[PDB]
Amino acid sequence: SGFRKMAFPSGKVEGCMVQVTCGTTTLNGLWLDDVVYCPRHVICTSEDMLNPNYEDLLIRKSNHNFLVQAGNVQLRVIGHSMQNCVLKLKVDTANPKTPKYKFVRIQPGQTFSVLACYNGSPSGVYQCAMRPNFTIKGSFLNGSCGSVGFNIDYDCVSFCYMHHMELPTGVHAGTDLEGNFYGPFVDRQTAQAAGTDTTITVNVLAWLYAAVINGDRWFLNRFTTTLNDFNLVAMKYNYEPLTQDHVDILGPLSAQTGIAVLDMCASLKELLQNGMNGRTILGSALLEDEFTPFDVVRQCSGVTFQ
Amino acid sequence: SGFRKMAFPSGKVEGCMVQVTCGTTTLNGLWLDDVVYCPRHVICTSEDMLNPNYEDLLIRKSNHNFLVQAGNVQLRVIGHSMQNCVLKLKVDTANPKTPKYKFVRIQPGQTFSVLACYNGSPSGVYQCAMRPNFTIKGSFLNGSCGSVGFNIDYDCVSFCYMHHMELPTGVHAGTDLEGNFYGPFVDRQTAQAAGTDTTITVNVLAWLYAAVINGDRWFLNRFTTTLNDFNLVAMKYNYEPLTQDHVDILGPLSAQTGIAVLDMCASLKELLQNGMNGRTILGSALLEDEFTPFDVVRQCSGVTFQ
Ligand SMILES: *C(=N)[C@H](C[C@@H]1CCNC1=O)NC(=O)[C@H](Cc1ccc(Cl)c(Cl)c1)NC(=O)[C@@H](NC(=O)NC(C)(C)C)C(C)(C)C
Ligand SMILES: *C(=N)[C@H](C[C@@H]1CCNC1=O)NC(=O)[C@H](Cc1ccc(Cl)c(Cl)c1)NC(=O)[C@@H](NC(=O)NC(C)(C)C)C(C)(C)C
């Protein structure tokens, strides 16, 4: 029993983190085979950030302008290129600890583990969700750029996020590992702000199923509702609409607990309208939306990785 | 900016987990140098648990009754002994991935990372605190026994917890790595229940400092209080008393924010008496007590490990 914000084991990723220095700027890089991936803003000075032409900035660099360190070993940079907003540094040595991996662009609502790093050295791991407004609510300090987000599927590391910047509201923005930003953000210092965020409805329902599995039943009721009646209520409270695909995804949890999805929706509708009234669910006094249906299955069934 | 429930990177510990089978029971073991540590209840059958004599049970086993697997390699057991409630299996091979490590018995209020494992394989990592009643609020399923809790200090892994059992309220009990239970629990199936829990006051104050560092100031006020006036209020709300040592530990956070500890205490006193009134702090609608002062410093200053 029990339910925690659980991250993936980070060992396979720790062995791929390196330090990258260009000029006075040091941040983190991801070393896979003979390529080091890092944010391209590493090549900028303070004067360039207002409107950088990255093609010009890169053509004026040479391979020896890039200092790449793996622990105490210096890696020799033999090539460099740019893909969207990531820099790819080719090095003379293939990382012997390269895991089986793939690169994946995730959707809002999905969750992943972040390995927060400073100077190439792992500092901590935590779980977060890609919000509907394409930011993440992370924890990052100076020097954390190039830290990556990932999932593990059996034996395979899926990299989905590389950290680039913090926005004025204190939330975070970055790219997939092919250098495409999530959301409307760009790597030039111009006025940018996150759009309004919404609550990830399918995840709240997953978490209410987790509560039932763990013995929290006080919010259940005998009613049922329809998708369209539920969604009319969800919209008013700034919740994402529920689709038939969401219903199907929750199937395994409905089956294990015996409570129909549309039954659970009537409970959520009541909680939205009357509040939780000084009660808690799974130790929380707010409805939690950063667990996917798969997170709940994994943690309430016991899936491992090799 | 930002603030998350952050666990330590787990790579150094993943390489020490093995699977241990005795009879029909399989659980996890910790392989360091040429010794595998695991809960001694692995040697029990269902009939023995009501009142096991572990000395008798162990004398009737031989080295080949213990099946120890590291991935796909079988490790050959060449000796076995018991230390308190842990079994130590001597094996013919020293773990080449043994980190620099030590064994530490922690105090209530301290936090640590748990690497949850099934069949020797890491499943997830999360952070928790050893409660004042010597339980932890973990997340564990069948087969998780022998999963360990740890901290990292520079380059050294400090093991502090090995998982043995779940109590009827859904919380968890285990031993240090020398086999001594935390709390009044014993490994015989008899009626046992956790004592009443209290809230870890010094940790709540640390977390209120974290909130200030991240821009949540609405709960501050101009007042100050005394230790003895604060503690009189804390007692009524089932909070641990605050000592002068607690005050000193919070020094670094007081200094970075400019708010005296006893100033912060007057804010907490107000929050206890009037509630948070539908407001949140660091995204929570309850006062959080599972971050130590050191956790906050580490996450709001950026300490890494090598
Ligand atoms: C990366 N090592 C570091 C991580 C930051 C520090 C605090 N929290 C974090 O997540 N980020 C940077 O160095 C980054 C460089 C940069 C500047 C400008 C642009 Cl457009 C990009 Cl894509 C990257 N700086 C910042 O994140 C910066 N924020 C902004 O400048 N944001 C706007 C205004 C461009 C939206 C600070 C947080 C002010 C350092
Ligand atoms: C270990 N692999 C497993 C982990 C459990 C499963 C569910 N959640 C967990 O944390 N634990 C056990 O196999 C354990 C064996 C055992 C039995 C009896 C005693 Cl005294 C000890 Cl120290 C260990 N069983 C249990 O944890 C058991 N709980 C109790 O029997 N608890 C009391 C009544 C002895 C307090 C179940 C949770 C019922 C399986």
- Residues on chain B touching A5 (C-beta within 8 angstroms): 5, 126
Do residues B209 and B252 make contact, with C-beta atoms less than 8 angstroms apart? no
Tokens of B123: 């499943």
Please list every residue in chain A whose beta carbon sits closer than 8 Å to the beta carbon of residue B143.
302
User: Ligand 1: does its nearest atom lie under 6 Å from the Cβ of A240?
Assistant: no
Encoded tokens for A246: 């969401």
Strands A101-103 and A156-166: parallel
User: Checking phi first, is residue A269 left (phi over 0); if not, alpha (psi -120 to 50) or beta?
Assistant: alpha
By CB atoms closer than 10 A (0-12, 13-18, 19+), residue B278 is exposed
**Residue A303, Cβ neighbours under 10 Å: how many?**
16
Distance of CA A87 to the CA centre of its chain: 20
**Longest distance between any two alpha carbons in chain A, whole Å:** 69
B200: CB partners within 8 A, 6+ apart: B108, B109, B129, B131, B132, B240, B289, B290
Bridge pairing between strands B66-70 and B35-39:
unpaired
| Token pair of B13 as six digits | 């510990």
Question: Rounded to whole angstroms, how far apart are CA atoms A9 and A125?
Answer: 8
From B62's Cα to the closest Cα of chain A, the distance in A is 31
What CATH number belongs to B15-99?
2.40.10.10
- Among B190, B118, B115, B191, which Cα is nearest to B160's? B115
Chain B residues in contact with A214 by the CB 8 A cut-off are 170
DSSP structure class, residue A40: G
Q: In one letter, which amino acid is B43?
A: I
Cα gap B225→B111, rounded to integer Å? 28
Q: Is B139 helix (H, G, I), strand (E, B) or coil?
A: coil
Beta strands in chain A (DSSP E): 17-22, 25-32, 35-39, 66-70, 73-75, 77-83, 86-91, 101-103, 111-118, 121-129, 148-153, 156-166, 172-175
Count of CB atoms within 10 A of residue B181's CB? 17
Helix (H, G, I), strand (E, B) or coil at A113: strand
Give the residue from chain A lying closest to B12, CA to CA. Answer: A11
**Rounded distance, CA B46 to CA B56, Å?**
16
Residue ranges of chain A that CATH labels 2.40.10.10? 1-14+100-197, 15-99
**By C-alpha distance, which of A219, A239, A221, A211 is closest to A279?**
A219
Q: Which residues pair with B172 in a beta bridge?
A: B136, B166
The two tokens of residue A164 are 């680039």
How far CA B275 is from CA of B120, B237, B278, in Å, comes to: 45, 12, 8
Superfamily of domain B198-301 in the CATH hierarchy: main proteinase (3clpro) structure, domain 3 (1.10.1840.10)
- Roughly what angle, to the nearest 10 degrees, separates helices A293-301 and A201-213? 20
**CA distance readout (Å), A126 to A138, A304, B13, B220, B250:** 9, 18, 17, 29, 24
The verdict on a CB contact (< 8 Å) between B124 and A10 is no
Q: What is the DSSP string of B5-43?
A: -PBPP-HHHHTTEEEEEETTEEEEEEEETTEEEEEGGGG
Q: How far apart are CA B177 and CA B297, in angstroms?
A: 27
Burial bucket for residue B154 (CB in 10 Å: 0-12, 13-18, 19+): exposed
Contacts of B133 by beta carbon, 8 Å cutoff, 6+ apart: B108, B183, B194, B195, B196, B197, B198
- Contact predicate B160/B113, CB 8 Å: no
Q: Which residues of B231-255 are buried (b: 16+ CB within 10 A; e: fewer)?
A: bebbeeeebbebeeebbebbeebbe
Fill in the DSSP letter of residue B100: S
Q: Provide the angle, in degrees to the nearest 10, between the axes of the packed helices B261-274 and B227-236.
A: 30
Are the C-beta atoms of residues A97 and A157 closer than 8 Å to each other? no
Kind plus residue range of the DSSP H or E element containing B78: strand B77-83
Two tokens at B64?
């080949």
* Contact between B303 and A123 using a beta-carbon 8 Å cutoff: yes
| Residue ranges, CATH 1.10.1840.10, chain A | 198-301
Question: How would you label A107-123 residue by residue, b for 16+ Cβ within 10 Å and e otherwise?
Answer: ebbbbbbbbbbbbbbbb
Whether domain B1-14+100-197 has CATH 3.40.50.150:
no
Q: In angstroms, rounded to a whole number, what is the distance separating the alpha carbons of residues B251 and A126?
A: 27
Q: Report the separation in Å between the CA atom of B28 and the middle of ligand 2, taken as the mean of its atom positions.
A: 14
Query: CA A143 to CA A124: how far, in whole Å?
Result: 14
**Residue A265: CA atoms inside 13 Å, Cβ hemisphere, count?**
24
Measure the CA–CA gap between A291 and A189, rounded to whole angstroms: 33
Overall size of chain B counted in residues: 306
